[PDB]
Design a protein around this nucleic acid. Structure first.
Lengths: 70, 140, 99, 136, 68, 140, 190
RNA sequence: GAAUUGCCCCCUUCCGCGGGUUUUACCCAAGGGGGGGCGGUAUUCGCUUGUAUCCUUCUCUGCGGGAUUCCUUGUUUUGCGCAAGGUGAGAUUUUGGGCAACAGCAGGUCUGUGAUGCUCCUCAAUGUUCUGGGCGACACGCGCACUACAAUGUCAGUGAGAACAAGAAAAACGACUCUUGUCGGACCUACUUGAUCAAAAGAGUGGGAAAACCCCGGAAUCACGUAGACCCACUUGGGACCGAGUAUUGCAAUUAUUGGUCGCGCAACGAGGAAUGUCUCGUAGGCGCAGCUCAUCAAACUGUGCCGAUUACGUCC
C-alpha cells in the first residue's frame, strides 16, 4: 500500500504523541522507518511537539536536525 | 551611514526591513511575478517569493559601498547556468529588476542619485536586533 | 598637468644611466627635485609551438619581453627643462615621454 | 479524511504528489508554467494533492489552462505563438500535443522542404553531427 | 580476547619480494625466564616500522622464514 | 599608543592595528568578532586570544583589513595579525620579561606564532594539465 | 581565565582521557586544540602523521570522491552532529568512545604474498601499529558512505552507528566484519 | 558636520557560625569587614563627508643580503659522507623551469618562406580567379581515440541571504576638419535612460593609450540559529531528441550560427566485465576566471587563482 504517506490521519497523530517522545534519540528519519509517513512531514510534525514541550531540541541545524526526550 | 555592516547583517537584519517595507506600504511591488533573475530552474518561479527579500539589499548595499548602482549590483547576484547542454558552466545574472527596485526605493531609502541615505531606517531597525524581534517562540 | 618625465625601455642598466645619474641637472645641482620612481614592470609573453609540422610529442616554447618604466617629477621649471632633458639622449631603445 | 490516489485532470490519471505543481507536470505542463497559481484561484503551495473540488476546486485550475487571455494576457509563455495556419493561438494541451506536432511534420513532408526530408529518414534535423553518435 | 605484545628492539632487514613487508626483531614480554624462554625472536611484519614501536601477537613459536 | 603588524597566508595579506581603549573590544573589517558567520572560522580567530589568557592580556582594541584570498585563508591571516600585534605592543610599551612569557604560550600551542608559511602553488607546465598529471593516450 | 588551560571540542573535554591499549597508545594522539581544522605538512616526513589530533584523522578521512564535494568545512559540520548523537545514545563523553572504536576496528594479522610459480602462496604476517590505526579510520568511514547512499535518509547518523558498534565489539558494524574475515584467512594460511 | 543612542562590574584576603569533623586539625553553606582593579590623554560608526597636519607597517621596483654551517663527539676509516635533533623565512639538487655531449634514424615536413635539385603544367592552364554555386576536418547501420555531463540526499536540487580571488587584455587602418604641415572617430568599459511593465535588444553621455578608466576587480567552490521547499523515486535525479515565436552578428546564417522563454522529458543512464591511464605536497581531486583563434561561435589549448586530502618515502618480483 503506502510505504510512506502524505496523510493527516488518526493513527499518525496517535502514534506520534505516544511512542515518539519516549525515544531517547529522535530524528525525522527514524519515523519513516516505521513505514508510516515520510521524513518530510515528520520534521514539521516534531516541531509542534517541541512547541508543546513533549520533546526537546539538541541542535539548531539545517537539514541535520535532531531532538531528544524532554 | 552604516547600512549593512552594523549589528549582525545576516538574514536577521534583512527580515526586519522586509517586515517594515510591508505594513505601511510606501513602495511599488510592480506586476511581473513571473520573472527569473537567477536562472536554471525547471520548477516554480520563486519558492519564497523573489520580491520579498529583494528590496532591502538594493538600498543597504548601495549605501554601504556608496554609489553602487544598476550594473554594479548584479555582481552579488548568483548563478551557475547549472543545466546546459553537456556544456560546462558560467556565472550570469539578469540586471533589470535592480532599476525598477531602486525606483521603488526612492520614496524611502535613497536620498538622491548623487548621494545616498537619509537618517538610515536600518540604523534603527538594526539596533533592535539586540533587543526585539516580531515574535519569540520555540526555536528562535 | 605638471612636468612629468617618463622613461621606458626594453632593458635595465639603460634606464639607470638616464634617470639615476644624468637627471643630475635638476637634482641638487640647481633646483628642487621631487623624485618618485619606478612602476610595475610588465611582461609580454608569447607562447609558440615548436614543431614546424604536425609531428612530435607536442613540445612548445615560451618567449618573453620585459618592459621597464620610470617616472619623475619637477615643480614648474620655466625652461630649465630644455637643459635638464637634453643632456641624456643616450642608449638605443630608451624613449622619453615628457608631459 | 479521504486521500487522493489516481485523480484526473484531463481524463488522464495523475499522481497525488504532495506539492501541487509537480502533479500537473503529467498533463504537459512543466514547472515554469504552473506558478501562475496566483491567478488560478487556488493560491496554494505546500498543500497536498487530494484537496480538490472542496473549496480549492479543480475546474478553477483547469479553465485557466484552457484560455489564458482573461486571467492575464502575456505571451512569451505559451507553447505556440503566431501559428502558421491561423493568426495566433495559445495552445496548452494534451490532447493535441501528438496532433498539432504531427500536422507540422505532414506539412513539410508534402512540398518537400529540407527539414521534412531529413525527418522522414529519422536523421537529425537541427545542426547536429552523426557518425559517432547517436548510435542506436 | 588474548593479545600478546612485544617490543621492537632493533630491525634486521627489509626483505620481501617487492619490498612489501619487512623483517624485524622482537623482544617478547610474556617471557618469564622459565616456561616461556625465547630471549629474542624474529617475526614478519607489514607496513612502516620504527624501533621502540610495539606490535601485537596472537601467535608465537613461528619464526620468520621457518624451513618452508 | 599604537603599533601595526601584518599576518599573511598564501596571496592574502592582512594588516592590523593595535590601540588603547581598555574597556573596548576587537572587530575585523567592520563586523565585530562574535558574529562572523561560518562557525568553524570564528573559532580559529578566537584562538589568538584564548591562548594567552583572556581579556587579562588584551582588552585593547584591534581592527584588521584583509585583502586577497578566499574565506579559509582570510581566517589564518587574521590569527597571525592579532597575535603579532599583541607581542609587538608588549615589546614597545612594556618589559622584555612579560613579552617573552606570551611567546612561550603561543609557540607551545599548535599555532607556532611565526607560521608565515612559504607554501604558495607551483606553475602549470606545457606537457601537463597542471603540475604532475600529464596527458592520457593509448598504447603505452 | 577560563580560556588559557581549557581546550574543548565545542564543550567536550580532553581532561581525563585514556587509551585502553598500550600498543596504539602513542599512535593515537591526544587532541588539545579547539576544532579539527589546521594546516598541513605532516606528510613531509615519514613519521609525523600520528602526531596529529585524532578528530582530524576522522574529518579528513571522511572526505573522498568528487561529486561537488565541499571538502574540509563540510566534513567538520557533520562530525559535530555525529558526536552529539553518540553522547545522548550511550550516555558517555564522545571522545572516549572514538579512541576505543579505533583500537578494535582493524586486524592484528594479515595475509600477503611470498608466492611464485605463477600462483600465489600466502603466509600469516603481523601488522605494525601504524597500519592498525589507519585501517580502522578507513573502514569505519567506508561503512558510513555505503550505509547512507539510499538507506536511512539520515545525514550524520550511520557514522555514529559504526563507531558505537565498533567499540562494543558488535558485528553489526562494517569494520568488525572485515577484521574477522582477514584473520580467519591469515591464521589459516599457515 | 551627519547617524545610532545602547551592555540580551571583577579579583584577592581575614573573621564568625550551623552542618560535614575523631576530641582536634581540616572542609562546605551563609554573612560581615579590610585590601586591589576600574571606566583611565577613548560610547560607536561614514572607500562621496568634508577641513588641516604628519607618516611609510601593508603596495611597487632596480641593485644587493640570506646556511652540510652547528651539535649529537651517534654512525663512518682519520677519509667521502650518512641518520636524528637544533638554528632559522627557508634544511638539503631550498622549490618549479629553461639549457644540455658523442654517435645516429634512409622518423616527420617539398601544406611555413623570393629554402630548393630534377621533372610535370602553361592562354579553352594544374597559373591567376579574394567570380557564382557545392564540397572540406560535417554527408551514415558500424569499430576505435580523447573530451564533457550524469546516475543525487558526504551541497543534494530548482529558492533566498552573507562574505570573497590574480595573472592578463584595449590605440590604428590616405577618409574627415585642422594650418601649413595635423585634430577627431573605427578598441574597451562605466553611468544614465529605455522601464507608468519579460528577457534578449535599443539610445544618449562620460572616462581610459593602462598601477589613473573598468576597479575597493563584490568569481565559483563555500558558508546559513535561513524554524524555506523537496523525501528515495528513474521523482522535483538527468536531460538527449523535438515544435513554435523573437532579437543580435555579417555583403551572404537555408543543412536550424549565436543568445534569450514556453512546450517536448513517460530518451538514455541506478556506480559500471576482461583490461588499462599518471600521480609523492600546496601535490592528487573538486571549482571558476582570463588569454589564445577572432564579424559571429570553445566541451580544445596556454596561463593564473580558490577549496585542499589518503597512502608510501621501499623493492626488483
Amino acid at each position: 500500500a503506502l510505504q510512506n504517506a502524505v496523510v493527516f490521519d488518526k493513527e499518525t497523530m496517535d502514534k506520534l504523541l505516544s511512542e515518539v517522545p519516549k525515544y531517547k534519540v529522535i530524528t525525522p528519519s527514524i519515523i519513516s522507518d516505521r513505514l508510516k509517513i515520510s521524513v518530510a512531514l515528520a520534521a514539521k510534525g516534531l516541531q509542534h511537539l517541541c512547541r508543546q514541550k513533549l520533546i526537546k531540541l539538541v541542535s539548531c541545524s539545517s537539514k541535520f536536525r535532531l531532538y531528544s526526550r524532554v | 551611514i552604516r547600512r549593512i555592516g552594523k549589528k549582525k547583517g545576516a538574514t536577521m537584519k534583512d527580515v526586519h526591513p522586509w517586515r517594515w517595507v510591508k505594513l505601511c506600504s510606501q513602495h511599488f511591488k510592480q506586476e511581473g511575478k513571473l520573472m527569473v533573475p537567477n536562472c536554471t530552474e525547471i520548477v516554480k518561479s520563486s519558492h519564497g517569493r523573489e520580491r520579498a527579500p529583494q528590496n532591502p539589499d538594493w538600498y543597504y548595499i548601495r549605501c554601504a559601498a556608496i554609489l553602487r548602482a544598476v550594473y554594479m549590483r548584479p555582481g552579488v547576484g548568483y548563478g551557475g547556468l547549472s543545466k546546459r547542454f553537456s556544456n560546462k558552466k558560467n556565472r550570469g545574472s539578469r540586471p533589470e529588476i535592480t532599476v525598477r527596485a531602486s525606483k521603488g526605493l526612492l520614496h524611502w531609502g535613497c536620498k538622491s542619485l548623487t548621494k545616498l541615505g537619509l537618517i538610515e531606517k536600518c540604523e534603527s531597525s538594526g539596533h533592535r536586533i539586540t533587543k526585539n524581534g516580531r515574535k519569540l517562540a520555540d526555536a528562535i | 598637468q605638471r612636468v612629468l618625465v617618463k622613461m621606458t625601455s626594453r632593458n635595465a642598466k639603460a634606464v639607470e644611466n638616464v634617470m639615476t645619474e644624468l637627471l643630475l641637472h635638476a637634482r641638487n645641482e640647481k633646483v628642487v627635485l621631487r623624485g618618485p620612481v619606478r612602476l610595475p614592470t610588465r611582461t609580454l609573453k608569447v607562447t609558440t609551438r615548436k614543431t614546424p609540422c604536425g609531428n612530435g610529442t607536442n613540445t612548445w616554447d615560451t618567449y618573453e619581453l620585459k618592459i621597464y618604466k620610470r617616472l619623475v617629477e619637477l615643480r614648474a621649471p620655466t625652461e630649465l627643462v630644455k637643459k635638464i632633458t637634453s643632456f641624456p639622449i643616450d642608449a638605443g631603445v630608451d624613449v622619453a615621454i615628457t608631459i | 479524511e479521504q486521500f487522493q490516489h489516481i485523480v484526473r485532470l484531463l481524463n488522464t490519471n495523475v499522481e497525488g504528489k504532495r506539492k501541487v505543481p509537480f502533479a500537473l507536470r503529467m498533463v504537459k505542463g512543466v514547472g515554469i508554467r504552473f506558478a501562475y497559481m496566483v491567478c488560478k484561484k487556488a493560491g496554494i503551495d505546500v498543500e497536498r494533492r487530494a484537496g480538490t473540488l472542496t473549496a480549492e476546486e479543480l475546474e478553477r485550475i483547469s479553465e485557466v489552462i484552457a484560455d489564458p487571455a482573461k486571467f492575464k494576457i502575456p505571451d512569451w509563455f505559451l507553447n505556440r505563438q503566431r501559428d502558421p495556419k491561423t493568426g495566433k493561438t495559445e495552445h496548452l494541451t494534451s490532447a493535441m500535443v501528438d496532433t498539432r506536432l504531427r500536422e507540422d511534420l505532414e506539412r513539410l513532408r508534402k512540398n518537400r522542404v529540407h527539414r521534412g526530408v531529413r525527418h522522414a529518414y529519422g536523421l537529425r534535423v537541427r545542426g547536429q553531427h552523426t557518425c559517432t553518435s547517436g548510435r542506436h | 580476547d588474548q593479545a600478546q605484545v612485544g617490543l621492537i628492539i632493533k630491525v634486521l632487514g627489509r626483505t620481501g619480494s617487492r619490498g612489501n613487508v619487512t623483517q624485524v626483531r622482537v623482544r617478547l614480554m610474556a617471557e618469564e625466564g622459565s616456561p616461556d624462554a625465547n630471549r629474542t625472536i624474529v617475526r614478519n611484519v607489514k607496513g612502516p616500522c620504527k624501533e621502540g614501536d610495539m606490535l601485537s601477537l596472537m601467535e608465537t613459536e613461528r619464526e620468520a622464514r621457518r624451513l618452508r | 599608543k599604537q603599533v601595526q603588524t601584518f599576518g599573511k597566508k598564501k596571496t592574502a595579506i592582512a594588516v592590523a592595528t593595535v590601540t588603547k581603549a581598555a574597556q573596548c573590544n576587537i572587530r575585523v573589517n567592520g563586523v565585530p568578532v562574535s558574529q562572523i558567520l561560518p562557525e568553524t572560522l570564528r573559532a580559529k580567530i578566537m584562538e589568538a586570544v584564548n591562548v594567552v589568557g583572556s581579556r587579562h592580556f588584551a582588552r585593547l582594541r584591534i581592527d584588521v583589513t584583509v585583502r586577497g584570498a578566499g574565506q579559509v585563508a582570510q581566517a589564518y591571516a587574521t590569527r597571525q595579525a592579532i597575535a603579532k600585534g599583541l607581542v609587538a605592543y608588549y615589546q614597545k610599551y612594556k618589559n622584555e620579561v612579560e613579552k617573552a612569557a606570551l611567546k612561550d604560550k603561543y609557540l607551545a600551542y599548535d599555532k607556532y606564532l611565526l607560521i608565515a608559511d612559504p607554501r604558495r602553488c607551483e606553475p602549470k607546465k606545457w606537457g601537463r594539465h597542471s603540475a604532475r598529471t600529464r596527458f592520457t593516450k593509448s598504447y603505452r | 581565565m577560563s580560556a588559557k588551560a581549557p581546550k574543548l571540542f565545542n564543550k567536550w573535554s580532553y581532561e581525563n582521557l585514556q587509551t585502553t591499549e598500550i600498543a596504539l597508545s602513542d599512535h593515537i594522539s591526544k587532541t588539545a586544540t579547539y576544532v579539527p581544522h589546521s594546516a598541513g605538512r605532516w606528510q613531509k616526513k615519514r613519521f609525523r602523521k600520528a602526531r596529529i589530533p585524532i578528530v582530524e584523522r576522522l574529518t579528513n578521512g571522511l572526505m573522498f570522491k568528487g561529486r561537488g564535494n565541499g571538502k574540509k568545512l563540510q566534513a567538520v559540520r557533520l562530525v559535530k552532529h555525529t558526536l552529539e548523537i553518540i553522547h545522548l545514545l550511550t550516555d558517555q563523553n564522545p571522545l572516549q568512545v572514538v579512541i576505543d572504536a579505533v583500537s578494535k576496528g582493524a586486524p592484528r594479522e594479515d595475509s600477503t604474498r611470498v608466492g611464485s610459480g605463477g600462483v600465489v602462496r600466502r603466509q600469516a604476517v603481523d601488522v605494525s601499529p601504524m597500519r592498525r590505526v589507519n585501517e580502522a579510520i578507513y573502514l569505519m568511514c567506508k561503512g558510513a558512505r555505503e550505509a547512507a547512499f539510499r538507506n536511512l535518509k539520515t545525514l550524520p547518523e550511520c557514522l555514529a552507528d559504526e563507531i558505537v558498534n565498533a567499540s562494543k565489539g558488535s558485528s553489526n558494524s562494517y569494520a568488525i566484519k572485515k577484521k574477522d574475515e582477514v584473520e580467519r584467512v591469515a591464521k589459516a594460511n599457515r
